[PDB]
Every structure is written in structure tokens, then in C-alpha cells.
């Protein structure tokens, strides 16, 4: 199927407690392969996947310089954005950045992206065409004007639909033996009385990949949305995900309910029913 390469950056100011905390993480699909943490012992970009360890000293020297350059940029941008948003020097603030590219199963470029946030809200994003920007407000528009004048979109595009694609293809070839593949969910239902008259029916989906999944509950073929308890999809810690959806039902009425599982690894959407007797 399709694949992605993404770099995630978080910089958090610590007024009067030193320089900002900076954490960078590189992923191929949902697999971390590199990391940098300003609070870590090495002060270097570090390998996190077995297939990246084979990279040479010049690779690690370059990744370290370049991740440190992003850290320094965020440090000055925290001061700049505090100015744009008219905030004091006392509070802690956050810059988040994500950029990357997607390729098809035949290695072809599909899309590139860059999104930036300030204090957990949109700040600026590169558009789908890789030529223009969308600023979230009037302060972020100051950055957009600076990047339009600097022709930043062209420079960034050369990386997103170029360099990013070249290296993502190399990493996919280098990690082909271990990289997580599509795995359909293993599904089952559990039954938990909450009293003498009611029970929780819990529909489980385990060991699946990708994380995208839809769990729905129906009472007599009619949707149960607003009565369903859905948990956030969560990591098993092995590269696959888990999720459950629950409904509180009257005892004796279990068979009226159906759980519906939709996933890209399944040939057909599944229907689960609690069958009593």
C-alpha cells in the first residue's frame, strides 16, 4: 500500500528555567526511526529502528546539525510569536511542526505537507499545491508574508516532492523485512452485567494495522450513535492497535444489538452479535 515519511517537532519555552525543551521524532508510516531530545545524554539524532542503524557517521552528523538548526529556529520563533500575539515573557508556550510526504505502493509521489501550530492551535500550513500558504489568523499572516517574500514554498517543495520521496523510497527498501504490514483486526464481543437488569456489550478489535478503523453499534439495524462508548484507538506497543466500542443493553435484549467493524485489511465489513442459548 501507500507509505509516509513524517518529522514531528515540539519546542516548549521554560522562562527562567533555561532553554526550551525540544523533541524531534521521525517516522516511516507509524514506526519511529529517529529521535532527538534536548534533554537526552547524546545531544545527537539517535536511531530508533533496526534498519536505520546501518547509516554511516556522515548521515548522523548531518541529521544532528539539521535537527539542531530546527531547534534554534523554534527558539527564536517562540520569542517572535510571543511578540505577534502580544504575550508576556513569563508564560510557557509551544510550537509544533509536522512535515512529510506520502508515496504509493509503486513508489510514486502522492502528496507533501507542512503544518505548524502555536499553543496547540493552527498557525500556518502549506497548501496541497505546495505553492501557497493558509495562515490561521492575522498574526500568522505576518509569517506568510515573510515566507512569500523569501520564496520559502519553492525551497520547501523541492524537499517535500523531491528529497523526502528519494529518502522515503530508500528507507522502505532498507526496512522492507520488518516494516509493519496491513493486519486485519481480530474481533470478539464481551458481556459485563452492571446490575440484575442491564449489561455492557463490549465489541473489541485487536492486533490491527493501520490504526484507521470504524466500530459502530446497531439496535435492530438502526444506528446507536450517542449511546455508544468509543475509546480512542490505542497502541498495543508492538506496532498494531486496539479499540473497543461499548453499549449498555437491557438483560434479555442482547441479540437485538450488532457490532459493525470496518477496516482496510478486511475483505468485507464484519457483523458481531451476542448469541445467547
Amino acid at each position: 500500500g501507500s507509505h509516509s515519511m513524517r518529522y514531528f517537532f515540539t519546542s516548549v519555552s521554560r522562562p527562567g528555567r533555561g532553554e526550551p525543551r525540544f523533541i524531534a521524532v521521525g517516522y516511516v508510516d507509524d514506526t519511529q526511526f529517529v529521535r532527538f531530545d534536548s534533554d537526552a545524554a547524546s545531544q545527537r539524532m539517535e536511531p530508533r529502528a533496526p534498519w536505520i542503524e546501518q547509516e554511516g557517521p556522515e548521515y548522523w552528523d548531518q541529521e544532528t546539525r539539521n535537527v539542531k538548526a530546527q531547534s534554534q529556529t523554534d527558539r527564536v520563533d517562540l520569542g517572535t510569536l510571543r511578540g505577534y500575539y502580544n504575550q508576556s515573557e513569563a508564560g510557557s508556550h509551544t510550537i509544533q511542526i509536522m512535515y512529510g510526504c506520502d508515496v504509493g505502493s509503486d513508489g510514486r509521489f502522492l502528496r507533501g505537507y507542512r503544518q505548524d501550530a502555536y499553543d496547540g492551535k493552527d498557525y500556518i500550513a502549506l497548501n496541497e499545491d505546495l505553492r501557497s500558504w493558509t495562515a490561521a489568523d492575522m498574526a500568522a499572516q505576518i509569517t506568510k508574508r515573510k515566507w512569500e517574500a523569501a520564496h520559502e514554498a519553492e525551497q520547501l517543495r523541492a524537499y517535500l516532492d523531491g528529497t523526502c520521496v528519494e529518502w522515503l523510497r530508500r528507507y522502505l527498501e532498507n526496512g522492507k523485512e520488518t516494516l509493519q504490514r496491513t493486519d486485519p483486526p481480530k474481533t470478539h464481543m464481551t458481556h459485563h452485567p452492571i446490575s440484575d437488569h442491564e449489561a455492557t456489550l463490549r465489541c473489541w478489535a485487536l492486533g490491527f494495522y493501520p490504526a484507521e478503523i470504524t466500530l459502530t453499534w446497531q439496535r435492530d439495524g438502526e444506528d446507536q450513535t450517542q449511546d455508544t462508548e468509543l475509546v480512542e484507538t490505542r497502541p498495543a506497543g508492538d506496532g498494531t492497535f486496539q479499540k473497543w466500542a461499548a453499549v449498555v443493553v437491557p438483560s434479555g435484549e442482547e441479540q437485538r444489538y450488532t457490532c459493525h467493524v470496518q477496516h482496510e485489511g478486511l475483505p468485507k465489513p464484519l457483523t458481531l452479535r451476542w448469541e445467547l442459548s
Binding site: 518529522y7 524531534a24 521521525g26 548521515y59 548531518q62 541529521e63 539539521n66 535537527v67 538548526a69 530546527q70 534554534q72 529556529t73 527564536v76 520563533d77 517572535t80 510569536l81 512535515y99 505548524d116 498557525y123 500556518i124 509569517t143 515573510k146 515566507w147 523569501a150 520559502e152 525551497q155 520547501l156 524537499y159 528529497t163 529518502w167
Partner: peptide, 9 residues
């Protein structure tokens, strides 16, 4: 690999 050029805001 990461970008080799950075943009100030």
C-alpha cells in the same frame, strides 16, 4: 532525512 534549510517565522 530532515530538511537542510530552516525558515524563521
Amino acid at each position: 532525512i530532515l530538511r537542510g534549510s530552516v525558515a524563521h517565522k
